[PDB]
Amino acid sequence: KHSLPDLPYDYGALEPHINAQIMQLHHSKNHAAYVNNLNVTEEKYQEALAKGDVTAQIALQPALKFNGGGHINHSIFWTNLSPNGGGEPKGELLEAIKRDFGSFDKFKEKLTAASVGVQGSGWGWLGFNKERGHLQIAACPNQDPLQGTTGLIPLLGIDVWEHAYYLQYKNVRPDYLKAIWNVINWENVTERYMACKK
Amino acid sequence: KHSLPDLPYDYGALEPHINAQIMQLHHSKNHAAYVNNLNVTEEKYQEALAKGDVTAQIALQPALKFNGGGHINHSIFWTNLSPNGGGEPKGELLEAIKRDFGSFDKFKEKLTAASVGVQGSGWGWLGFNKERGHLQIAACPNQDPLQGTTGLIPLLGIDVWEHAYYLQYKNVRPDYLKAIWNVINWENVTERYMACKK
Amino acid sequence: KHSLPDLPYDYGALEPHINAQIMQLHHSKNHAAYVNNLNVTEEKYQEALAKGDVTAQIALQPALKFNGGGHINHSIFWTNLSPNGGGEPKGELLEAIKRDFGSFDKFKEKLTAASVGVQGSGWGWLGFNKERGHLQIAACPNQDPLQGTTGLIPLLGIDVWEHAYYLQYKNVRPDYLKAIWNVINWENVTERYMACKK
Amino acid sequence: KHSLPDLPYDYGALEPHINAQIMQLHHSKNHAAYVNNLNVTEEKYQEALAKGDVTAQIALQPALKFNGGGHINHSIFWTNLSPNGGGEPKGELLEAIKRDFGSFDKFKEKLTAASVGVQGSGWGWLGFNKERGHLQIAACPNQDPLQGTTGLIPLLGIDVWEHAYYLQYKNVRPDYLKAIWNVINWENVTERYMACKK
Ligand SMILES: [Mn+2]
Ligand SMILES: [Mn+2]
Ligand SMILES: [Mn+2]
Ligand SMILES: [Mn+2]
């Protein structure tokens, strides 16, 4: 059913901002484990649902949210990065950022603060509030996906799990966040943003 | 396909301990609301599981645990009560209570304490730890079902949601728990216990 | 030492929207219990804080958030209602509602859904986002306070705990929600609103 | 005011099980960040507590549980490890384990599963249920302390945050777990255990 998507760039394409070892491991080991367990949990849920086992379906929720979210999160993350990214977004998105956060630098601080703030494992997200018609920064615990738990549309996600920066930046999460702005695929983020107004 | 089970006694069978209006509204309203929304959520889950929409499967979880657990919880509760109940259990159920909690009265206080202790909506439970082979008391938030969220198999449940006592005992929950001991179907919990030892 | 604030109107001043029985018990019993538990909890906290007992401090956390929250929430709640209430706000507040939700009728529908959506015990809130300079609807579980857990400034609160409406509306929360609009002290909300733009 | 307890052995005393860099960074940087943010948080809480600001008290909670728990957890953790440790405990502890888990090798699988099972950041714990006079295995999320959030008295803890192994064992948590059994200070646990039957 579910597959591990190919990275749209090589492992060391985000150097030095994100090394090739973090990239190789994060993709081929972490994301891959998510994709597998998701398939197995999804099939065990199918059997339970068809059998009317409500207890089982409920006992499988944690594994489904974790591995499902893990696959949703990482898939979006790969597309959010790029060796040709960085700088500031172009077009409407940069303008929407001006409205909702004041300026690009203010947006940068806020999302960096939401990411640095995650106590434990989690993600920092720039999303879109469909009901409201504006952008919205949000953080999520462990592998809880943005849309499935808040209804917000993911535009730019920054993984702040220790596995996404420890081998290189160690305990200095702030340095990791500062290095990632250099490899942000703004063309992708503007794609997802434009796809919302639809 | 799930259905609202009938009560093994009529609406005013638990007087004066639990009034007919409570019994009637609890079963015909709350429980009935749980079974329908559960069926709709499952059918909605089959549809998303068929399109591999992980986001949909996850945005459906709260409704499934809430309504599904609501259904599991109350179905057990109904059977746990009886117009011929009260007193104390017999045989090895009583012995497992003495061994695990010291005495019936100690067990009473413990389950009463756990039930009186839920802040907000919840359930106080007496379950069986199949792993360790013994009785264990637990408390659960809202409609979180004992087994699906904790692994313990439910034997005796006590609904401490305000809708299960307010119209009668108002804000004095400990008076409800004092009264509930009189209509406890120990025959049903004994059976529920014995099925764990098989 | 916290004190139970006096009601700014007679226990029956909100009829036939929220019967006098509910208002009497809700204030004199429910709200009273929190105030009292909070005073006992803070007292116990100053003791653990002094001894550097991090364990007791953390152990007292649920009790303080629950009781401290019950007091914060209801204190604001009583000030949100009025015998001379109902209708629609005007000027600065009605304006701000229109920009953030479109119309007053939409604002109502949105706060009504957020409040009805609460599974178990909780509240529906109209708050203000100081960082974003605009309004924002939010839902809080159990007695978790708006400002203390979401960081938003409380503007209008509507208690959806079952004790807040059950005796009059039974299990139909929507009716309670439709009725409560008739006693809203908009004069108070705008003042809370002005304090944010202050 | 709290302080970083001196490690009872040098950073490389747990090699090849736990490398010198993990130990180095873990104690001097991670555990250090906790004691400091705790001292900041407490001071701020005694401040807010003094004014009776229940909002600030509640808003400080996550930071207190997080940092206070981080200080409590790691302080204990350092004692649970020793270069001259490993093997099996003896006397009353081994018997307790045999009785409450079947055998030592069974206890290990159990404490290993709880630890491997935590999704995201957390800890696996072997504790003591003073209420039931027996050993109990619990898992705690993030820095949530055992006794403060569970009541169980801590006997042996296993940090399963990625920073506790990722630098060495990478994505494979099971390896860190197989290895940690080698440097476990079964003399310290026996002491903590004997302190429970006091
Ligand atoms: Mn990751
Ligand atoms: Mn109920
Ligand atoms: Mn209330
Ligand atoms: Mn650690």
Cα gap B95→B102, rounded to integer Å: 9
**B172 alpha carbon – ligand 1 mean position (Å):** 48
Residue C6, in any domain of the structure: no
CATH number at residue B140: 3.55.40.20
| Torsion C130-C132-C134-C136 (CA) sign | negative
Chain B: nearest CA to A158, how far in angstroms?
18
Q: Amino acid letter at A91? A: G
How far from the centroid of its chain's Cα atoms is residue A190's Cα? Answer: 15
Q: Is B197 helix (H, G, I), strand (E, B) or coil?
A: helix
Residue C196, in any domain of the structure: yes
Residue C4, in any domain of the structure: no
- As given in the structure block, the two tokens for residue D39 are 């001292």
Ligand nearest to the backbone CA of A66: 1
Indicate whether D166 and D193 sit together in one domain.
yes
Indicate whether C58 and C88 sit together in one domain.
no
Residue appearing with tokens 């705990």: C161
Indicate whether C123 and C77 sit together in one domain.
no
Is the CB of residue B29 less than 8 Å away from at least one CB of chain C?
yes
Query: B185, B197, B90: which is closest to B134 by C-alpha?
Result: B197
Phi-psi category of A15—alpha, beta or left, where left has phi over 0 and alpha has psi -120 to 50?
beta
Q: Among B42, B61, B82, give the residue marking a domain's end.
A: B82
CA distances B62 to B32, B45, B80, B145, Å, are 18, 12, 26, 12
CB-CB neighbors (< 8 A) of D121 in chain A: 120-121, 162
Q: Among B58, B82, B106, give the residue marking a domain's end.
A: B82
What is residue C81's DSSP assignment?
Answer: B
Ligand nearest to the backbone CA of C161: 3
Indicate whether C45 and C75 sit together in one domain.
yes
Indicate whether D88 and D162 sit together in one domain.
yes
Indicate whether C136 and C188 sit together in one domain.
yes
Select from A29, A142, A171 the Cβ nearest to the Cβ of D171: A29
What is residue B180's DSSP assignment?
Answer: H
Which technique?
A: X-ray
Q: Which parts of chain D fold into alpha helices (H)?
A: 20-25, 32-51, 54-79, 92-101, 104-117, 146-149, 166-169, 173-180, 186-194
A163 is in an annotated binding site: yes
* Residues 6+ positions from C186 with CB-CB distance below 8 Å: C85, C87, C88, C89, C90, C93
Query: C74, C56, B53: which is closest to D68 by C-alpha?
Result: C56
Select from C1, C59, C145 the Cβ nearest to the Cβ of D58: C145
Instruction: Sort C194 into a burial class: Cβ within 10 Å, 0-12 / 13-18 / 19+.
Output: exposed
Residue A142, in any domain of the structure: yes
Query: D2, D6, D9: which is closest to D28 by C-alpha?
Result: D6
Residue A65, in any domain of the structure: yes
DSSP string, A29-74: IIIHHHHHHHHHHHHHHHHHHHHT-HHHHHHTHHHHHHHHHHHHHH
Indicate whether A95 and A156 sit together in one domain.
yes
Indicate whether D68 and D109 sit together in one domain.
no
Contact A37, D117 (CB under 8 A): no
Maximum separation of any 2 CA atoms in chain D, in Å: 54
Residue appearing with tokens 């609160």: C157
In this structure, the dihedral spanned by the alpha carbons of residues C127, C132, C133 and C138, taken in order and rounded to 10 degrees, is -10
Contact A68, A145 (CB under 8 A): yes
Indicate whether B108 and B180 sit together in one domain.
yes
Contact D128, D193 (CB under 8 A): yes
Q: Among C45, C63, C82, give the residue marking a domain's end.
A: C82
Q: Is C23 helix (H, G, I), strand (E, B) or coil?
A: helix
Which chains does D contact via 3+ CB–CB distances below 8 A?
A, C
Is the CB of residue D163 less than 8 Å away from at least one CB of chain A?
yes
Contact C87, C72 (CB under 8 A): no
Q: State yes or no: cis peptide before C16, omega within 30 of 0.
A: yes
Which residue segment(s) compose the domain that B51 sits in?
Answer: 19-82
Ligand nearest to the backbone CA of B120: 3
Is the CB of residue D24 less than 8 Å away from at least one CB of chain A?
no
Verify whether the Cβ–Cβ distance D163 to A167 is below 8 Å: no
Indicate whether A153 and A192 sit together in one domain.
yes
Pick among A142, A161, A168, A175 to test the D interface (most D CBs inside 10 A):
A142
Verify whether the Cβ–Cβ distance A57 to B149 is below 8 Å: no
Is the CB of residue A32 less than 8 Å away from at least one CB of chain B?
no
Q: Which residues are paired to C158 by β-bridges?
A: C124
**C162 alpha carbon – ligand 3 mean position (Å):** 8
Q: How many domains does chain C have?
A: 2
CATH number at residue A47: 1.10.287.990
Q: What is the resolution of this structure in A?
A: 2.3
**D27 alpha carbon – ligand 2 mean position (Å):** 48
Indicate whether D58 and D31 sit together in one domain.
yes
Cα gap C123→C138, rounded to integer Å: 8
Pairing label, strands D134-141, D153-159: unpaired
Long-range CB contacts (within 8 A, 24+) of A16-25: A16/A179, A17/A179, A17/A180, A17/A182, A17/A183, A18/A81, A18/A165, A18/A168, A18/A179, A18/A180, A18/A183, A19/A167, A19/A168, A21/A167, A21/A168, A22/A163, A22/A164, A22/A165, A22/A167, A22/A168, A25/A163, A25/A167, A25/D170, A25/D171
What is residue A12's DSSP assignment?
Answer: G
**A29 alpha carbon – ligand 4 mean position (Å):** 22
Residue C9, in any domain of the structure: no
What is residue C28's DSSP assignment?
Answer: I
Cα gap A99→A93, rounded to integer Å: 10
* Residues 6+ positions from B105 with CB-CB distance below 8 Å: none
Residue D12, in any domain of the structure: no
Residue D3, in any domain of the structure: no
Indicate whether C154 and C140 sit together in one domain.
yes
CB-CB neighbors (< 8 A) of B56 in chain A: 148
CA distances C28 to C7, C21, C24, C74, C76, Å, are 10, 11, 6, 12, 16
